[PDB]
Design a protein around this ligand. Structure first.
Ligand SMILES: [Zn+2]
Lengths: 98, 397, 397, 397, 397, 133
C-alpha cells in the first residue's frame, strides 16, 4: 500500500531512477494520491467486482466457508446435486469466529 | 430508527431518479447505495401487525441485484425494478403503521415493535444516508444533544379555551365587569367589558388583563396584533358561572386604551409593545400578557351620551378588545400547526385500523387534551410518531 | 411530457451548481447528463405561438459542448455556459406558455402544441432525470395508476355559496326560522335562527342542520371547529327568497346546543365529533354534515327574559352557529389552495396573452365555476396545466 | 457573499449524509468538495463581533483532512469529523450574526463586517456550489440582472392602517356618510356607511370607494374577496376626526351593490371583477381599488321600513362592506409574510444582542414603518439581511 | 468536557499515590497516563478570565517527563514533581471558575469559555481516564441518552412557600376555616383549622387537603410522615389575604382524622398510605396530596366541652395537621440538597468574583427562583455548572 | 453471591475507565479480568422472572473477546464494546430484581432464585475482585 505500488508507478513514467528518492518522498507521494476520485472507467469496474465477489467465492468447487460443531447427533440433509450430504446455507444461532 | 429513514429517501430518490432513458451516471452513486441494502436484508424474516384491525402480514427476502452495466436505461430495466420496489413500498407502509401505535410510559421515546426493535440492530446500520428531511435532521441533533428546532405556520399552541371571568357581578347580571376570551390554536381574542362604562371608576378607566401560558416556549414568532375582538362584539345570552341562569351581553365597542403586550419567558419580559398594532416579533417566550383599558369617553355627542347614563339600567355595555395571531414560530418540541399533516396522519392511521386507546395518548389523539397535559412521555412518543409519519409521507400520501 | 420536466431540473440544478469556483467532481455526474441533451437537440427546428397575442419565435440549434478538462471552474468557463443556458431559458418559457392554453375535450389529459407533440417523440426520451419535484412525482404515478396525492394549506374545495333557507316564514318576515351560510374555499360558517326562540317548539329546542358535499374527497384533513358564526351575528337587511322585498335580521347569539359534526364518505360516517371545538381530524370524507340546536334558555335573568316574550313582535332573534375551517388536507385531485401559485400562474399567462375562452375551462379560469362542475376533462386538463406551471416555476417566477 | 452560502449546504449536505454506516460512494463527490475548503482556510485568522452586546471570539484553523479509504463508514470516522464540524457550526453562527446587524446608507447593499469583507476576497471563491436554496438562487440572478422573484403565503404588503373618512358629517355626528377601514398585512376590510340610507341620494344609491396603493407590485396573486366587513358590522363609539369628541356607529348591514374590484398597474386596469366573490386572480398590480354602493331597498317589510325613516333621528346606520385577502403572491422584492421566519430571525438576533438603532432600519425593525417607507436602501439591506438569515436557518433554527 | 474530568482524577490519584517511599510498580499504570498528558499540552497556549472582577491569566507549557527508571521513590523525586503539579492545580482552578460563570440560552448545555471551547478539540481527547466520580458517570450516560440518576439527603425540591387559604372567612375573621402551610426544601407542614370545630358540618367533620406539585419527579424517596404541624400549633396574628388588616389564630390541636397521603405521577396514584405515620416509601411521583380531616370530638370532658361552644365567639380554634419530610430520594435532574456543596460552590465563585447577572440564572443563583421556574435551559446550565464544581472539589475545597 | 458483586465493579470500573481517549496500559490489568468472565459464561443459559408482574426473559450468551489496538482507544473500539455491556446491564438488573423478592423462613439467608442458585456454583468463582464497596 506503501511502496509496492509507488515503485511500479514511477518506473513506468521512465524519467527517474527511483532509489535516490528520499523515503519522505515516496510515502508523501501516497499521502497525496489517496485523495482523488478515479477514472469513472477504473472505478466503475471495481464496484462491479465487489458486488459479485461473494457469489464467486462460495460458487467454487474447491473451498467453502467454515464449519459448525454441534456434538448433537444431527440429521444429515439431502440435495439433488450432492445426494445425501451435510451442508447448510445458513449459520445463525452459534457464535462466529473470524 | 435512523435506519428506517434511509429505507425511504432510498426509494423516493429512487422511484424518482429512474425513468426510461436517463444516462446511467446520474445514478452510479445511487445504484450502489441501493444494492448494499438488498444484501443486508435477504435471509431475514419479518413480522408486523397484531392489534385491533391491523393484519398480520409476514415478509421474506431473496432478490437479484441491479445490473450496473448499461449506459442508458432501457424500459425493460425499469419494470424489472419497479416490481422489486413495490414489495418494499407495500412493506414499509406495514412497518411504519406497526410502530405508529405502540406506546410506552417509561422509555416511550425508543423503538417498540418486533419489527423495529430488530432494525436498530447493529448489522443493519450499514445503510444510513442523505438526512436532509427536516424531521430526521432534527431527530439526530436531539439524540446527540443540541438546539433542535422546527418551522411552522399558524402553529397549534393554545388548547381550546372559551370562557369568561366576572370581576363584578350580581344576581340580575345587569351591571357586570370582566373579561371573556377564546384561546385556540395560534389565536387569542379577549374582550374586557364594563356595563357601567367606568362611571364610578378611578380616572373613569377600568383596567383589564389576559394572561396565556404556553405549554412550550415559542421562539422567532411573527405575530399580528389588532385592536378589537370581533368574536365578542355582538349580543349574546350566556350561561352564568354556576350554570343556574343566563345573562345578557349587549356590547358597544370602544378603542382599547393603553394597550400593552408582554411576551415573557420565566417571568421576565423579553418583548413588550405599547399600543402597536400590525406585525410584531416575539423572539422567545412561554407567556403572553395582554393588558388594556376601557376609558370612559371624556367628551360625548348626544347619541353617545345616551348610551352611558349616570344610573342603571345599563343597556349598552362598553367593551374593548384585542386579537393576537401567531402566524409563524419555531418550537423546540413538535406541535400540530396549520400546514403539516403529521398529526392528521398519525390520527388517521390509528382511526382507520381501530387502534385501541393506549396508556400515553388521549383518546382520539385529541389535540386540546394532548397540549393541555403535554408530558415528557407524550412529547417523546409524539416526536417518534411524527417523525415516522414524515418518513411515510415521502412515499405514501 | 416527462421530457419537459428534465429540461428544467437540468437547468436549475445547473444555473445553481455551476459557479466561479467549485471542484469539478460536484458536477461530473451532472455535466454528463447535460451534454447528452445538447446532442439529441441540435438540428431540430421548433415553432411556438400562433394564437391570440403570443409571438411566434422560431428556434434553431447549433451549440458546442462542455470540456471536462478542468478541476476548478474558472470564471471564463461560466460565462461561455450561461450564454448557452439563456437560450434554453428564454426558450422553455415560450414552450410552457404555448401548451399552457390549448384545451381538448376528447384527450385533454394529453399533449397538444406543435412544440410538445414533437417532444413526446421517442428519440427524445434519452433525457429524463431527477423526478423529485412533488408534481412530477405525482404525474407519473397517475399514468401507471395508483394512490396519487398532494398537500394543501387552507385548500379551495368549497365553491363560493352564500345563501339562506327559511324553514318558517310569512310575508311580513317577522317570525322566521331557518339557516344562512357562507361556504367558500376551505371555510364554512352557518347560523340557525329562530325568531320565536323555540317558544312553541318541542322541548323548547329547534334543530338545525347544514350539509356540504365536496366535489372531491379530502383525506388527512386538520380542521378547526369553533362555536358561533361571526359572519351572521350582526343586524342585516336581506332580500327575500323571491327578490320582491327585504327582511330584517337582528341576531342575539346563544351557544349551539348538541353540536354534532359528521364527516361522511359515500353516506357512511367516517368521523363524528360531539360538541368538540378546537382541532379535530377528518381522515377521509366527501361530505360534511353539521347538526346543532337552539335551546330556549330554561332560566333567564330579567334582561334576557325581556328579549324573548311569549307573543310577537319578536325583536331579538335567537341565533346559534358554527365555524369550520380546513387548515390542511390531502386530495387525490389537483385543487387551488392558499399557498400554491399554480392556478394563478395558469390564469395569469392566459390573461396576459389574451387567450380566447376554450371548450374546457370556464371563462377566466373562474375557480368557483371550475370546482362546481369539476368534470373529468377539466381535472385532466387542470392537472396537465398545473404540472406545467410547476415546471415553469422552477426557472421563471 | 455567495461564498458564505456554500459554507452551509456544505455542512447540511454534510451533517446529514455522514452517519455510522453509509457507503463511501454516496459521498465521493462530496468528501472532495469538503476538503478543498479546509485547505483554503487554515492559516487565515478571523475576528467577529464587537458592536453591541456581542462577544468577540477569535478563530484559528489547521485541521487535518479526511480519508478516501474505508468504503463503509465506521463510527470512529464520524466522531473524528463531527468534532471538526462543530467548530464551523459555532463559527458560522458568530459570522452570520456579525454581518446581520451592520447597515450602510451609501453602499449598504454589499458586505460590511471585517469578517465578510475578507470573504468576498478572491482566494476564497474556490468553494461556491449547490445554489438550489430558493434565496441564493435569487441573490445571484439579481447580481447579473433578471426577473428575480419569491413565493409568499398571506404576504405582508399593507402597512397597518385603521381609520375613517367622513364625507358628510356635522357636530352632532347624527347623520354621517363615509368609509372606515383596516388595511393590515395581506388583508383589507372596508365599510361604507350612510346614516340616511340614501333617502335623498340620486337613485337612492350612495357610492363608496376604497383605494390602496401597494409599495411594491405583486404578481400572480390568489385572492379571496367576500362581501361584508365583519370588523365594521358592530356598534362602536369612535373618536371624532379632530379628537374633540366621540360619535356613535350603530350599523345594520345590506349587501354591497355594484361591487367592482380593479387591480391596477401604473394607472392601468390589469384585472377587473364585477361582483365576483370567492377566489379571483390578480396577475400584476400596484394598486387595488374597491368600488361599491349602498342602495336603499326599494321594497321593505315593516320591520325594515322602521329602521329607515324619512326624517332624523337616524338610529340604524345602513352599512355595506367588502373583505379582500391576498392568500399568496409573488413579489420581486423581499417582504415579510405569514410563513417565512426571516423578518423574525433578523429582528430577534438584533433584539437579543441589544444592537443599537442604525441609520437604515426603523427602530425594532418595525414592519409597518419599514414597508411604509420602503426605500431602495432599506430593500437592499433587507434583502442582504434576509438572505443571511436564510443561510443561517439551514444549520441553526 | 470529559477532558476536564481526567485532568483531575489525574492529579488526585496523583498528589495522593506519589510519596517518599512506595514501589514504582504500583504506579506504573499511572505514571504513563500522566506523561501522555504533558505531551499533548506543551506548545499549546491558553487564556482564562476577562469577565467582571476576574483576573485574566495566560499560561504556556514546556515540561520534562518522569523517571520511569528507579525502583523506589526518593524524596528528591517527589519535590521535582509537586512543583510541576502546583502549576496545574493553580491552573485548573482558574479554568473551572472561568466556565463556571458563563450562561447561554440556545446551547446552554455545551462549553462557553475560550479556555474550554479549545479543550473539546479533538487533539486533546487523548486523555480520558477513571470515571468513577458519581457526577461524570452521569454526565456521559446523559450524552448517550439513558436513565441517569443521583443520590440526595434532605433534597431541595420545594420552593419556599408559606401561606394560607381561607375557605370560610368574614371581615371580623372570628370564624375562619382553611389551611396554612410551609413548603420548603424537603419538608411540608400543613394545618387545617376550623374555628367552629365542625359544629354545623356534615358528620361534624371538616375535610382538608394540601397538594404540592414537584417541578421534577423524585424516585426511591424515603419519607417521614408525622401527625401535627408544630409550626402552626401556636397563637398567631396574621395579615389578612388583602393585606388590609390582621386576624388572630389561637389553635388547639386534635389528631388528624382519616389521613391519606397520595404520591401521584401524571395524575395516577403510585403510592397511597392511610393514616400511616413513621417511615414510608414513595417510589416515583411528581405530586404529593395530603388529605386529612378535623372531626368534632363526639365525647368531651367539661374542660374540652368548654373550648367548643354551640355559638360564637369561637375562642379556641380546632386545628389538625401533618408533617412530611423527604429524607432521601433520587432525581434524574440535578438539585440542591442538604449535603452536596455544588450549589454553594457555583454561587460562591460567582459572588466572590462579582460576576454580573446573566440571561439564564436568577440573581444570586436564588434557589427558590431557580426551582420555581426550572426550565430546560436552567437545568442544562445547572448540570454543566454542577459537574464542573464537582470536578473542582476533587482538588480544591 | 460474592460472584454477583464482581459482575458489577466489573462493569462500573468498566463503563467508566473505558473511554474514547485513555491509553491501553491504564486498563491492561482491567481488560484481562474482563475477558476471563466472558469465557466462563457463554453457553450456560439463564431464567429470570416468574412471579407477580415480573417478566420472564431468557438470557443466552455468545460474545467475542476484546481487542487491544495500542496507543489509546479509537472510538470504534468503544461502541463495539458498549454494545456488549448493555446486554449485561439489562441483564444484571433482571437478575438482582429476581432474587430481591424471594424470601424463606428456614434458610432465607442464602440464594433462592434459579438464577443465583446457579451462580454460587463452583465453575464461576473464578471472578471475584476489588471488594471495596
Ligand atoms: Zn394561513
Amino acid at each position: 500500500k506503501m511502496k509496492a505500488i509507488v515503485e511500479d508507478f514511477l518506473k513506468r513514467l521512465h524519467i527517474f531512477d527511483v532509489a535516490r528518492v528520499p523515503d519522505d518522498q515516496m510515502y508523501r507521494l501516497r499521502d497525496r494520491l489517496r485523495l482523488l476520485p478515479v477514472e469513472v472507467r477504473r472505478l466503475d469496474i471495481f464496484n462491479l467486482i465487489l458486488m459479485n465477489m461473494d457469489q464467486i467465492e462460495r460458487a467454487s468447487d474447491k473451498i467453502a466457508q467454515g464449519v459448525i460443531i454441534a456434538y448433537r447427533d444431527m440429521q444429515l440433509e439431502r440435495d439433488e446435486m450432492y445426494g445425501y450430504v451435510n451442508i447448510a446455507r445458513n449459520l445463525d444461532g452459534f457464535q462466529q469466529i473470524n | 430508527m435512523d435506519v428506517l429513514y434511509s429505507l425511504s429517501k432510498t426509494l423516493k430518490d429512487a422511484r424518482d431518479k429512474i425513468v426510461e432513458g436517463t444516462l446511467y451516471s446520474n445514478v452510479s452513486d445511487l445504484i450502489q447505495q441501493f444494492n448494499q441494502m438488498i444484501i443486508t436484508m435477504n435471509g431475514n424474516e419479518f413480522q408486523t401487525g397484531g392489534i385491533g384491525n391491523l393484519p398480520i402480514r409476514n415478509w421474506n427476502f431473496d432478490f437479484g441485484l441491479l445490473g450496473t452495466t448499461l449506459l442508458n436505461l432501457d424500459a425493460n430495466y425499469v419494470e424489472t425494478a419497479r416490481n422489486t420496489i413495490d414489495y418494499f413500498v407495500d412493506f414499509v407502509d406495514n412497518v411504519c403503521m406497526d410502530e405508529m401505535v405502540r406506546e410506552s410510559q417509561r422509555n416511550g421515546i425508543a423503538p417498540q415493535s418486533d419489527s423495529l426493535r430488530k432494525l436498530s440492530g447493529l448489522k443493519f446500520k450499514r445503510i444510513n444516508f442523505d438526512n436532509s428531511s427536516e424531521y430526521i435532521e432534527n431527530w439526530n441533533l436531539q439524540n446527540r444533544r443540541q438546539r433542535t428546532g422546527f418551522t411552522f405556520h399558524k402553529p397549534n399552541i393554545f388548547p381550546y379555551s372559551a370562557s369568561f371571568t366576572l370581576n363584578r357581578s350580581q344576581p340580575a347580571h345587569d351591571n357586570l365587569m370582566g373579561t371573556m376570551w377564546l384561546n385556540a390554536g395560534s389565536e387569542i381574542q379577549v374582550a374586557g367589558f364594563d356595563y357601567s362604562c367606568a362611571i364610578n371608576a378611578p380616572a373613569n378607566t377600568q383596567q383589564f388583563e389576559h394572561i396565556v401560558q404556553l405549554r412550550r416556549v415559542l421562539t422567532t414568532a411573527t405575530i399580528t396584533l389588532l385592536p378589537d375582538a370581533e368574536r365578542f362584539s355582538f349580543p349574546r345570552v350566556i350561561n352564568s358561572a354556576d350554570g343556574a341562569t343566563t345573562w345578557y351581553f349587549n356590547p358597544v365597542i370602544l378603542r382599547p386604551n393603553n394597550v400593552e403586550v408582554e411576551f415573557l419567558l420565566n417571568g421576565q419580559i423579553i418583548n413588550t409593545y405599547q399600543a402597536r398594532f400590525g406585525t410584531i416579533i416575539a423572539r422567545n417566550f412561554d407567556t403572553i400578557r395582554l393588558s388594556f383599558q376601557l376609558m370612559r369617553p371624556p367628551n360625548m355627542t348626544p347619541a353617545v351620551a345616551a348610551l352611558f347614563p349616570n344610573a342603571q339600567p345599563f343597556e349598552h355595555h362598553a367593551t374593548v378588545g384585542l386579537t393576537l395571531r401567531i402566524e409563524s414560530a419555531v418550537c423546540e418540541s413538535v406541535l400540530a400547526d396549520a400546514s403539516e399533516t403529521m398529526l392528521a396522519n398519525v390520527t388517521s392511521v390509528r382511526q382507520e385500523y381501530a387502534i385501541p386507546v393506549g396508556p400515553v395518548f388521549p383518546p382520539g389523539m385529541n389535540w386540546t387534551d394532548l397540549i393541555t397535559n403535554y408530558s415528557p412521555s407524550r412529547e417523546d412518543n409524539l416526536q417518534r410518531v411524527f417523525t415516522v409519519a414524515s418518513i411515510r409521507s415521502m412515499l405514501v400520501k
